[PDB]
Amino acid sequence: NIVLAYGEWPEYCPDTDATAKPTRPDVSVNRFYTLDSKMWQENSTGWYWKFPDVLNKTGVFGQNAQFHYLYRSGFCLHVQCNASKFHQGALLVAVIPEFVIAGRGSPHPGFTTTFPGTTGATFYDPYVLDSGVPLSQALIYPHQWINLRTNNCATVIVPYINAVPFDSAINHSNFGLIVIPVSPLKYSSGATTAIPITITIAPLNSEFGGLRQ
């Protein structure tokens, strides 16, 4: 049913120094944030979303992660696409920690290419994941297939993976959520051309330390 990233069930920080202190916010921030639905077509090529960049400037999490210079949280990711029984295809939904966009053409990528926002950007070369690293071996990461004749939803629960127990939520993005159609979408003439893909994010154990302004 659910994929559990590295078998952890994320928790709070144990007994760290410089915190006696950090606020543990309630379900006002731990609700279900539903992003936009991306239309997956025949010539579509994939998408990626940076975390926690997709929940900056959005709701209570935007007002906390912009006015705090420490941050630690784990997420619950729920990707679901709504297709009929006459469409076909497959999606690869993986979670890549420290997902670095490379830059192409023998030339560094822009700000909106690596930090796309809520509207996550699209791949240019999904075969090499836009990082010179092949999709053929991209099943090392916590993944789940969305095959349109078997299932529609994929649930991945990601803990906090970092070498430092507290960083800033604006500069550093911990992981990325790729959704790449490995097998393309085919349909007979008359069906719906675009199939939406909706994503729901619920933060689990968010912490914030040190308040501004």
């Binding site: 023998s106 090499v128 010179g132 690293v133 090392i140 070498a163």
Partner: protein, 223 residues
């Protein structure tokens, strides 16, 4: 032909990074006024593409390092001249000349070994402010500023011959690094595209090389 099972001691994460190989070569060329007389070397393991491809299979690594300096002359005949292998820790300034005051700072641990001696071996601990070295950083330190992590600095060495009146040697230091107590946390796929730069994952998208060599048809297993 093989019926039995091999050993599981040789596949471990500490034996995969076990042996010491070449990691950097510098040159002194002492003598005269137009020549410098010293040679520094920033410690990095991403210099040669054989250790770079092995260490970019993982994101977080934590290790010690011990070094060995094999110095010969230009021809090979080694007369006894006393050398100095200093060590500038991260946060300390590098030397500016062969007679500068950074050679006499007592907080830079230097090693005085002649040319005729066996090579000077010394060990360097874990020197990061974090708890693991990061080789992939998705952030900014605040175009060319993306993906730079200053928590990977280890130091220099600044080889110098100890003399007074400008001996005419032309030396060549070879640095051999051994990785000890290696711990690697999260894995990632091995790179298929050839390297373009030293610090960046750029891959020249105008020609995407494939990860499997071609065959005639899908129905013939002979390749």
């Amino acid at each position: 032909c093989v019926v039995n099972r091999n050993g599981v001691l040789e596949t471990t994460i500490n034996h995969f990074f076990s042996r010491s190989g070449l990691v950097g070569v510098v040159n002194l060329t002492d003598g005269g006024t137009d020549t410098t007389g010293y040679a520094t070397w920033d410690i990095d393991i991403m210099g040669f593409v054989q250790l770079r491809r092995k260490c970019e299979m993982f994101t977080y690594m934590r290790f010690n390092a011990e070094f060995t300096f094999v110095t010969t002359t230009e021809n090979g005949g080694a007369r006894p001249y006393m050398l100095q292998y200093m060590y500038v820790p991260p946060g300390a300034p590098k030397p500016t000349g062969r007679d500068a005051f950074q050679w006499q700072t007592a907080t830079n641990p230097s090693v005085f070994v002649k040319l005729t001696d066996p090579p000077a071996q010394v060990s360097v601990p874990f020197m990061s402010p974090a708890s693991a070295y990061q080789w992939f950083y998705d952030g900014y330190p605040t175009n060319t500023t993306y993906g730079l992590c200053p928590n990977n600095m280890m130091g220099t060495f600044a080889v110098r011959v100890v003399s007074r009146e400008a001996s005419q040697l032309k030396l060549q230091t070879r640095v051999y690094m051994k990785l000890k107590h290696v711990r690697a946390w999260v894995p990632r796929p091995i790179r298929s595209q050839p390297y373009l730069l030293k610090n960046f994952p750029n891959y020249d998208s105008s020609k995407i090389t494939n990860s499997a060599r071609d065959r005639s048809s899908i129905k013939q297993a002979n390749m």
